[PDB]
Amino acid sequence: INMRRYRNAARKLIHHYSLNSTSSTEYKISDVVMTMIFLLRSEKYHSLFKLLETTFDDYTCRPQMTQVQTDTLLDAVRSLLEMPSTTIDLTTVDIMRSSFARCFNSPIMRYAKIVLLQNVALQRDKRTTLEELLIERGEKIQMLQPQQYINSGTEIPFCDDAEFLNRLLKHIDPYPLSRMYYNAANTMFYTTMENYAVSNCKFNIEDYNNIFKVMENIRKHS
Amino acid sequence: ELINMRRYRNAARKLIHHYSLNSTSSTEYKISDVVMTMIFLLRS
Amino acid sequence: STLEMTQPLLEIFRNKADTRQIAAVVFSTLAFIHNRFHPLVTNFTNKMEFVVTETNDT
Amino acid sequence: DFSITEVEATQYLTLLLTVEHAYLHYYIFKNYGVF
């Protein structure tokens, strides 16, 4: 039984859900199943497996766990991910769990019903928007002085030898720079806005789209 | 005597990993860290 | 290249132990964009004491 | 001969777009005040 291969596949699913991998076409059901099998056959991870099992709304009953247990679990998680280099809020993982509950309850068929929604899961929020946000901000900002500044030969640094630069040019030359924008930047920006779900700001693409009509203007002015 | 052999070892392992395997510039790492590497070597 | 570049940019920003470099990077980038947009521009240089934001609540 | 990593060059780039986006608002303010 190729536990090894099963894990090798499985990983990517959680990897994506946790953090927005710029890979794609992650989806398959078999991968999910193998993930669950691995978790079942991973005693040390059985705690996580039994938590992730909890996927039913009328019975949403994620148990209390001592901070000790929670930390041990997060260690396990990070290790298995081979990414201790950072740690993410358990809350993110539970939100992804609620997402998986969506998936479970959705009998999505041949039709590629990509959910496309940004995650709505969260608890005990209040509905908020830019109004509330602004009202909040002022005091929290003005209560603190800025830290510091000092001069360091500040004024107008400028360019240097063009051929010196052509060195770096040639270094840079081959890469898929035209794609690099999607390959990290834009995806990461757009995904960053889960902060809106934090404290339930109703994010709207309806202005995020503004970029599109914005970009025309250069072509208008040739 | 007083030595933080543990952290010295950890930084040294990290170094040697990227250094001998990725074969790329050690911009993350510093001379002090190399020194502690030799300390660990000499005592190990 | 003239900068005290501190190449491991992400970890430099991840340091938290100092903010001088962070502020200088910010400011210099601002100037860069400005001089991009127009060829002949500058900002008064005496001091602009600035802030670090620490949490979503802030 | 500087070993500039292709990957990290990505992050080196990415900030600039955000900063430019800010620059827009800065310009608008500087020309038209708070409101």
From Swiss-Prot, chain A:
<comment type="function">
    <text>Plays a role in host nuclear actin polymerization by recruiting p78/73 protein that is capable of activating an actin-related protein 2/3 complex to initiate nuclear actin polymerization.</text>
</comment>
<dbReference type="GO" id="GO:0044423">
    <property type="term" value="C:virion component"/>
</dbReference>
<comment type="subunit">
    <text>Forms a complex with proteins E27 and p78/83. The interaction with p78/83 mediates nuclear translocation of P78/83. Interacts with protein Ac102. Interacts with IE0.</text>
</comment>
<keyword id="KW-0946">Virion</keyword>
<dbReference type="GO" id="GO:0042025">
    <property type="term" value="C:host cell nucleus"/>
</dbReference>
<protein>
    <recommendedName>
        <fullName>Protein C42</fullName>
    </recommendedName>
</protein>
<keyword id="KW-0426">Late protein</keyword>
<keyword id="KW-1048">Host nucleus</keyword>
<comment type="similarity">
    <text>Belongs to the baculoviridae C42 protein family.</text>
</comment>
UniProtKB/Swiss-Prot annotation, chain C:
<comment type="subunit">
    <text>Interacts with host mus209/PCNA, cdc2 and cdk6. Forms a complex with proteins C42 and p78/83.</text>
</comment>
<protein>
    <recommendedName>
        <fullName>Occlusion-derived virus envelope protein E27</fullName>
    </recommendedName>
</protein>
<comment type="function">
    <text>Acts as a cyclin-like protein and plays a role in the modulation of host cell cycle. May promote G2/S arrest by interacting with host mus209/PCNA, cdc2 and cdk6. The cell cycle arrest is characterized by an intact nuclear envelope, concomitant with sustained activity of host cdc2. However, viral DNA replication still occurs in the arrested cells.</text>
</comment>
<comment type="similarity">
    <text>Belongs to the baculoviridae E27 family.</text>
</comment>
